[PDB]
Amino acid sequence: MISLIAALAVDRVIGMENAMPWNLPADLAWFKRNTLNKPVIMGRHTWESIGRPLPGRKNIILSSQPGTDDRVTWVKSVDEAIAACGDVPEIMVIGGGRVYEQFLPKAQKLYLTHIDAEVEGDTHFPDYEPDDWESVFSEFHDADAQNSHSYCFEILERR
Ligand SMILES: NC(=O)c1ccc[n+]([C@@H]2O[C@H](COP(=O)([O-])OP(=O)(O)OC[C@H]3O[C@@H](n4cnc5c(N)ncnc54)[C@H](OP(=O)(O)O)[C@@H]3O)[C@@H](O)[C@H]2O)c1
Ligand SMILES: Nc1nc(=O)c2nc(CNc3ccc(C(=O)N[C@@H](CCC(=O)O)C(=O)O)cc3)cnc2[nH]1
Ligand SMILES: [Mn+2]
Ligand SMILES: [Mn+2]
Ligand SMILES: [Mn+2]
Numbered sequence: 001m002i003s004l005i006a007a008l009a010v011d012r013v014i015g016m017e018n019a020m021p022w023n024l025p026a027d028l029a030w031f032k033r034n035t036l037n038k039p040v041i042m043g044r045h046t047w048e049s050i051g052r053p054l055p056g057r058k059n060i061i062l063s064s065q066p067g068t069d070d071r072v073t074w075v076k077s078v079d080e081a082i083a084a085c086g087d088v089p090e091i092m093v094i095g096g097g098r099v100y101e102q103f104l105p106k107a108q109k110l111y112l113t114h115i116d117a118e119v120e121g122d123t124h125f126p127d128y129e130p131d132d133w134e135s136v137f138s139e140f141h142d143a144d145a146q147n148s149h150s151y152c153f154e155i156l157e158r159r
Helices: 025-035 044-050 078-085 097-106
Strands: 002-008 013-015 039-043 058-062 073-075 091-093 109-115 133-141 151-158
Touching: 002 013, 002 025, 002 097, 025 109, 025 151, 039 044, 039 078, 039 097, 044 058, 058 078, 073 078, 078 097, 091 097
Parallel strands: 002 091, 002 109, 039 058, 039 091, 058 073
Antiparallel strands: 109 151, 133 151
């Protein structure tokens, strides 16, 4: 099974200038809990944005060019990325925009955080047809002293 996980600001913005400008520790905790001990697939730009391997996960990087770091696994196509994960129950695709576009048709589950923040961005999450997805979990949180915007965690499953 393939799942996508992402955090979206208003208008489905996911990034700006190869960065995420907000800081929401509760969402990073949700990301870690839902990805630990699973393989994670990311594109090369997101690998450069993160800047180091994510511990406790098999890190698979999609790039058309040879890898430059043997702490992670480099693959050259979607099919190779999937095969490199082996026979696991759940593969997590962690972006960015171009990578989400390619895996969305193959995904059975979306883990989405909706952040109530207006962000100038240059990268968006793909348009997804709402009729194809059922919301199976949602949890709203007001802003607090650690998290400066309200946010909604949602899990959707393909119908
Ligand atoms: N809010 C969130 O949840 C979230 C999550 C992830 C990322 N982001 C943000 O998203 C942005 C990065 O997104 P992005 O769309 O620019 O880039 P991306 O999807 O991270 O990376 C695209 C790169 O991945 C490689 N790639 C993608 N598909 C491939 C394929 N089929 N075969 C081979 N290589 C492939 C290519 O690398 P080569 O050029 O080396 O071939 C391509 O240029 C940043 O702003 C980051 O902060 C946000
Ligand atoms: N919901 C969600 N939030 C995100 O921030 C996110 N980020 C990415 C890509 N970028 C990043 C950037 C940093 C870290 C990171 O530092 N993660 C640590 C945090 C642990 C914690 O804060 O408790 C990790 O071990 O996962 C992960 C992904 C992809 N999907 C996401 N999905
Ligand atoms: Mn092929
Ligand atoms: Mn197999
Ligand atoms: Mn806000």
